[PDB]
A = this chain, B = another copy of it.
Amino acid sequence: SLLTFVGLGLWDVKDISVKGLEAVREADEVYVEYYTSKLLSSIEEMEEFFGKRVVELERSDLEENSFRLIERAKSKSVVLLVPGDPMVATTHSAIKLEAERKGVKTRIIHGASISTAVCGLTGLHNYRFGKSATVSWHRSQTPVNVIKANRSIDAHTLLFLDLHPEPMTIGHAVENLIAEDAQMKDLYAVGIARAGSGEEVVKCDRLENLKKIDFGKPLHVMVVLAKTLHFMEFECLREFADAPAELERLVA
Contacts and interface: CB of A to CB of B under 8 A. Distances in A.
A18 B15 CA distance: 6
A129 B130 CA distance: 7
Interface string A1-14: 00001010110111
Interface in A140-169: 149-150, 152-153, 155
Contacts of A85: 112-113, 116-117, 119-120
Interface stretch (A27-35, A67-75, A212-220, A231-239): A231-239
A58 B112 CA distance: 25
A93 B14 contact: no
A150 B19 CA distance: 35
Given A14-B22, A15-B17, A7 B96 contact: no
A90 interface: yes
A16 interface: yes
A181 interface: no
Interface stretch (A100-108, A203-211, A242-250): A100-108
Contacts of A113: 85, 112-113, 115-116, 126
Given A125-B90, A149-B153, A152-B152, A112 B115 contact: no
A93 B232 contact: yes
Nearest to A9: B17
A88 B116 contact: yes
Nearest to A156: B131
A196 B152 CA distance: 33
Nearest to A87: B120
A227 interface: no
A16 to B, nearest CB: 6
A87 B19 contact: no
A51 interface: no
A132 interface: yes
A195 to B, nearest CB: 9
Contacts of A107: 198
Nearest to A235: B97
A54 B33 CA distance: 37
A191 to B, nearest CB: 18
A123 interface: yes
6 contacts: A85-B117, A88-B116, A93-B236, A100-B239, A115-B116, A149-B153
